[PDB]
Write a protein that binds this ligand. Structure first.
Ligand SMILES: Nc1ncnc2c1ncn2[C@@H]1O[C@H](COP(=O)(O)OP(=O)(O)O)[C@@H](O)[C@H]1O
Ligand SMILES: Nc1ncnc2c1ncn2[C@@H]1O[C@H](COP(=O)(O)OP(=O)(O)O)[C@@H](O)[C@H]1O
Ligand SMILES: Nc1ncnc2c1ncn2[C@@H]1O[C@H](COP(=O)(O)OP(=O)(O)O)[C@@H](O)[C@H]1O
Ligand SMILES: Cc1ncc(C[n+]2csc(CCOP(=O)(O)OP(=O)(O)O)c2C)c(N)n1
Ligand SMILES: Cc1ncc(C[n+]2csc(CCOP(=O)(O)OP(=O)(O)O)c2C)c(N)n1
Ligand SMILES: Cc1ncc(C[n+]2csc(CCOP(=O)(O)OP(=O)(O)O)c2C)c(N)n1
Ligand SMILES: [Mg+2]
Ligand SMILES: [Mg+2]
Ligand SMILES: [Mg+2]
Lengths: 550, 550, 550
């Protein structure tokens, strides 16, 4: 009569649900679980800090619509992972953080257990759901719930708490197998009200100056061909949000990106496709026409009327909504006013010329424009890469200058503006895709996850880390206002050589000061498939400090 | 008519309350505050991640009884800092995390503000109190509350939330000055019931086998001379918990450390001095006599009877309680039974011999014992250092082998067993004391805060980081059980050279493989006062993996 | 071999800790527990709603310094009791609410258990501590914790969660008895810093116009004789807060009550004794001298400097602090300036004149002043009674007009101004004391707990309920501003006859429209010891509506 235990049950449940990879940091009580998951054919990726493990899991979820799995220990590891779970929920990336926890009886009495925390309740504010499994026979259904919650509705983070006792708990093997649940279609199609689709098309056809905004929800939906067909059929100018860049190529003739300010100031009907009217769009206030009318395709009815009143909500999943939108358009065709497309193109050209001037003017030291022009030179020739990006000036300029050619290839600071997502997102992207990654990193930003370069080396991952070294936060020319000569609050070490970090882990380093050197280093980085750091010397005075001037 | 603003008011309040140092990471909306604090003479220490900034603040609080100040931005930075605030509260270290927050109106409506989070409510589970200041005239009293809460009762973390609007808000300068509060004596003496003191002494005098346990609460109290006088007067064997090592020197004749298991198994009366009967003491169950009677000196009445029933609670602050305990002993002297001290010494000697054998037997590669014997050789000659320590085997063995000679010189993983406190604790210790720090780090442990080596270099801090490189978590000889040849979940990169990391920041690196090399490198590290990493090659099979074997 | 179960263990634990009474409402899973507690000689008082059970428990706690026990079922009953637990914690009244809960496994997975709620975490925001007991061997220590937490520091509510499984769980009886914990002295003396006592006396001695404010913390402490001795020795004018009335008699020559506004506006040094500078004292702002200097005796260091900076904090328990204050006064005697006392008396005289004027003037219908004068006449001659009071006009006028002669006899809406405490407070006071109770109730206030008149009848409790029936909330002469003739939002039924409710339960009812009728009815009610309602017809226009006038 064969027995098994909780730890074996949960691994089998993960296996049956097509989990291929776990991202984590081990320790009591989950080391055996990780070892056994790896024994059973799941790829285990161990990190230097759980935050990056959680970011990697979230990245994998965004890219695939299958929740990323993050594994942590109890309280101290759990809390580190929770910061990443929170970010997944805020951005809408599906993942499950699985954490060991301690003795329920001791923790419930606050007696000072090993790594004591009510982790389930701790996670609740930051997750779509937090579940805790006390009986090994409930592990299968618990994971089924976790999967469904993570990927349904607006996707997000779920916390799954496994007390040490449940991992050790035994039951008969044959019986245990009957309790494992393989979830089919955890996020089924949800189709919008046909009347709302009809109203959406009717309003677009009446519009003098329509604009589509594609958010990362649009990207996530993978409805790439349908979105392109709709945009091209009615010739509707579109604006891609950061992680929606590439659904249509950034150089597409209908992209209004190069005239973003004008487009938002003047559009009379704006169709939001999986994009929130949050701070990233100034809440539809500053910079917008006074009486913009909105159509909004979103799966989350709670998002409607959060900021500006929405004239035409289209509630349902974007793929399904676009099916209806396309069928309605076919029956009631329209063409966006030529004069609107023309005026957009006039503004786009003026701005493109101003940009070109900056990109093409060499300086010493390098600035953000000529440095990113060099990067763009290389990426234009290496279009099958993933791009991770974080920083302040490093982020905003790379977003503007680096064109995406394919969808779901750009991963950045996102909705909460998190510095520290770089290495995790690179590891998750690389593991998930098998493709090279280029991480364009601010020097401050890099410092939040920089130890994970050892993880990149340990797994021989094709990540090239390009650090825009301006010697600090926003700028590197700060002064201690007391006169004491200390580093200012935004200064980092003068002329640090981040490339040299790779020596410790047998990776590759390049120091670059010119566009020619940068082009050569980055080309070699990508083609070599070797873990590489490129230290780029950037004018300490080139950047701008974000925020209000008093 | 001169005006000022919230940001100026809070800095002046910090100044008036003798805050000398702020540990933080800047960005919107706190960059100006940090710049101005530095202008006004406060030392600003900027980190690569807020977690280490928070750990540094907590360390400074433990060492001084003045709350450490940690400064962060809104949501993403706040959450990183919160993990450290939680650790301060769990350990009982006084600190205040001051964080910027966003627009109260937008956040209260969940409209998707920049870095949106109800941070005040987020912090509540992890802090003694979380306050939020909406009016600049309330900044003075808010800081007064924060100071009092952080250092009174059981000390801990307090969260102080400063919305961007309060920092910008103006008022008349003369009026503003009248609203600033300088707190005198925020943690006043609290004396125990005299009858409890009488009962405590009476029970000790009746005891056949009394034992004092000194916890880090005892250390924190700074009642070093009183504790020594009491212990020496009645000749009571004592056991120092980890961060209480050194209150009396570890080689003191009455230290029962070398017979810890015997002492706990046999003592009939145990006097807990600022030490919880939590997991670190097996909750007074496994390894303890069946009917141990307890005396407990603690400031927190809620701690009494958490685990074992306490026969004699002595509730009050330890310095005050020891005043009464000493006065009562003087009036009613006793001597601990000689036969108890003798049997303790018999066990201590046997264990010391077993230890000596391990310490003195050279091996190749080095193991934990001979490597820490080399460290002990050096530290015996450099007794005016601070010791930071984290890891699993690296922690337990260094705790056992490295003697402390002075109080409040040892900082480690603490109550929650956190990996990642090393660099923050080193920075906080170094800045607070002006003394050299030796950080004895596991290689996994180091990876949780390793980027802060740049911070150490930026401020030219005398920190020597000694990394016990066994190539992974607990051990470095793991195998992928699938047969695929991947790194196992506990393996780190084979033969990483952490010393080489310092090259990037113009620090010093040593690689060591023998005790002679280790002695030389560590001696040079300390004496040079230069930021140094020592990479110690440790037998990958020397350590033990913690946890239960199934 | 004799077995027992968790239900028997917790009952024995309550019995050993001198719990004499449980206030509750039963149902699954606690009915058997109540039956058995009652079998074992604990008095069981069953209510019509858990909120009143919780208020009764809190009142018992305030009167005795022994935590009142409230027993409820799972989710629905728990949540009702929680509202009362919250109120106890806000007011600082010691109590333990013990609730059954459902199946931890099902609730942790949110699968829709019977009465599903994580009650332990639900309670945390409203309680000093929330504990949940999973193993029957831990019941004794859990109760010990709950007791100690509830009465130590600032007393408050504690939540104790008993899953149905722990109640049914068995263990050996002999072993179970060894796990029961009898708590001795759960709130021991905590003595103030001697320097703070010296400073307090020195400041009072220098004061031209000193004033003591006695709060309900002072009443709770039971230091009646010490407080009186101090006040009378130095001849310090005092102001009692509502539930501190009667520590010294309200007609005491040194009471500044009749000149409260004058006293607060003109005192130069104010000594708060167990009283917060919260809204009840206008936060030390409106109506206070501009630069009042405060002395504050409080057990809670976190309370110091919450509102106005406190010149002399005296942190410790009031009984201990007053021992010190008296000793220090005896060595350094003083009396307050006679001029200050004489001038206070001038102002009291003026206000008492105007008060007794209104009190003595008949009207038809009755108003608050002449009605409460009649009440005052009777209560003067029955100084053994407890006074419960709630309403708006009914509360404020009764507080001013009805003098208390003995301490801890007045129970009211308290710090959160709760309507709905009346019946519960009356039942708790009557059961605790064995004395008659008079509840002076607004008609709206009464409606919040009125069904508990059946409970009063069921237990034949000597409660006389005097309802000030003005036909509404504040006033009874509101008008529907639409012109439709509906009751206004503040109107209750015209000429309701609440005395008739007693007929349902075989109680006594009186309807009164004159002061002579009221005198007779109230005298008869108290003397008869029978449950009685007196419906007092009050002029609908007599009251004032509280709040800001636009
Ligand atoms: N498959 C889907 N169908 C419809 N809406 C989706 C889908 N996936 C995500 N969403 C919605 O997409 C939106 C993403 O918005 P946001 O994260 O603000 O994007 P951006 O930052 O690119 O503007 C969310 O409101 C979310 O509910
Ligand atoms: N000055 C003080 N006086 C009395 N008790 C204190 C003081 N400072 C801290 N404490 C108490 O000291 C205890 C520290 O215990 P703990 O952190 O468990 O130490 P350890 O890990 O060394 O056993 C806490 O229970 C805390 O309330
Ligand atoms: N035994 C005691 N010794 C000292 N302070 C106490 C004691 N019991 C309660 N307190 C304190 O008494 C205060 C009561 O204040 P509060 O409820 O505002 O009274 P009031 O409403 O009468 O002004 C609280 O601050 C509490 O901490
Ligand atoms: C976790 C976290 N901490 C702090 C911030 C505040 N912050 C915004 S940008 C930034 C870094 C900007 O400097 P860098 O990455 O070097 O980019 P640069 O502008 O210099 O190119 C920081 C720390 C944040 N967004 N997230
Ligand atoms: C934040 C956090 N994550 C994970 C753990 C689990 N954990 C316990 S010890 C340990 C590291 C042990 O390895 P190392 O520091 O290299 O010490 P060694 O035993 O190898 O000397 C970890 C990751 C923890 N305590 N804290
Ligand atoms: C639980 C609760 N709900 C509502 C209120 C608001 N409130 C203040 S006074 C009051 C009743 C006032 O009317 P009444 O009790 O009849 O006294 P009157 O002034 O008419 O004498 C109410 C409902 C409250 N304090 N508590
Ligand atoms: Mg930078
Ligand atoms: Mg190691
Ligand atoms: Mg009324």
């Amino acid at each position: 009569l064969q027995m098994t235990d909780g730890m074996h049950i949960i691994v089998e449940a993960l296996k049956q649900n097509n989990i291929d990879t776990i991202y984590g940091v081990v320790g009591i009580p989950v080391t055996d679980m990780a070892r056994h998951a790896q024994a059973e054919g799941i790829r285990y990726i161990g990190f230097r800090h759980e935050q990056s493990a959680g970011y990697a899991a979230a990245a994998s979820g965004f890219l695939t619509q299958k929740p990323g799995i993050c594994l942590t220990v109890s309280a101290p590891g759990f809390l580190n992972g929770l910061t990443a779970l929170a970010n997944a929920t805020v951005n809408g990336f599906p993942m499950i953080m699985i954490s060991g926890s301690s003795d329920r009886a001791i923790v419930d009495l606050q007696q000072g257990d090993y790594e004591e925390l009510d982790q389930m309740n701790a996670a609740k504010p930051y997750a779509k759901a937090a579940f805790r499994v006390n009986q090994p026979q409930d592990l299968g259904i618990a994971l089924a719930r976790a999967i469904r919650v993570s990927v349904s509705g607006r996707p997000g983070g779920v916390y799954l708490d496994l007390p040490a006792n449940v991992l050790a708990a035994t039951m008969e093997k044959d019986e245990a197998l009957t309790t494992i649940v393989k979830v089919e279609n955890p996020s089924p199609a949800l189709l919008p009200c046909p009347k709302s689709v009809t109203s959406a098309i009717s309003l677009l056809a009446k519009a003098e100056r329509p604009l589509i905004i594609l958010g990362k929800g649009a990207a996530y939906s993978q409805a790439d061909e349908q979105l392109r067909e709709f945009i091209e059929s009615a010739q509707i100018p579109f604006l891609p949000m950061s992680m929606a860049k590439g659904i249509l190529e950034d150089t597409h003739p209908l992209s209004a990106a190069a005239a973003r300010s004008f487009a938002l100031a003047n559009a009379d009907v704006v169709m939001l496709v999986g994009a929130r009217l949050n701070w990233l769009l100034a809440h539809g206030k500053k910079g917008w026409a006074a009486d913009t009318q909105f159509i909004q395709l979103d799966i989350e009815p709670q998002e409607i009327d959060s900021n500006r009143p929405i004239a035409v909500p289209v509630v349902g999943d974007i793929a399904s909504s676009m099916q209806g939108m396309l069928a309605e358009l076919k029956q009631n065709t329209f063409t966006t006013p030529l004069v609107w497309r023309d005026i957009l193109n006039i503004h786009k050209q003026q701005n493109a010329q101003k940009m070109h001037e900056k990109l093409s003017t060499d300086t010493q030291p390098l600035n953000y424009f000529n440095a990113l022009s060099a990067v763009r030179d290389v990426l234009r020739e290496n279009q099958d890469i993933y791009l991770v990006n974080e920083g302040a000036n490093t982020l905003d300029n790379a977003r503007n200058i680096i064109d995406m050619y394919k969808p779901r290839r750009r991963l950045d600071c996102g909705t909460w503006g998190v510095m520290g997502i770089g290495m995790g997102y690179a590891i998750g992207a690389s593991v998930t895709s098998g493709s090279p990654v280029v991480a364009i990193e601010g020097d401050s930003a890099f410092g939040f996850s920089g130890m994970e370069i050892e993880t990149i080396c340990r797994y021989n991952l094709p990540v090239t880390i390009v650090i825009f070294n301006n010697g600090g936060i926003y700028r590197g020319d700060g002064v201690d206002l007391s006169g004491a000569g200390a580093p200012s609050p935004t200064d980092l070490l003068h002329h640090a050589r981040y490339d040299k970090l790779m020596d410790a882990f047998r990776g590759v380093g390049y120091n670059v000061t010119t566009t020619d050197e940068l082009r050569h280093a980055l080309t070699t980085g990508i083609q070599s498939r070797k873990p590489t750091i490129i230290n780029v010397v950037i004018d300490p005075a080139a950047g701008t400090e974000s925020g209000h001037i008093t």
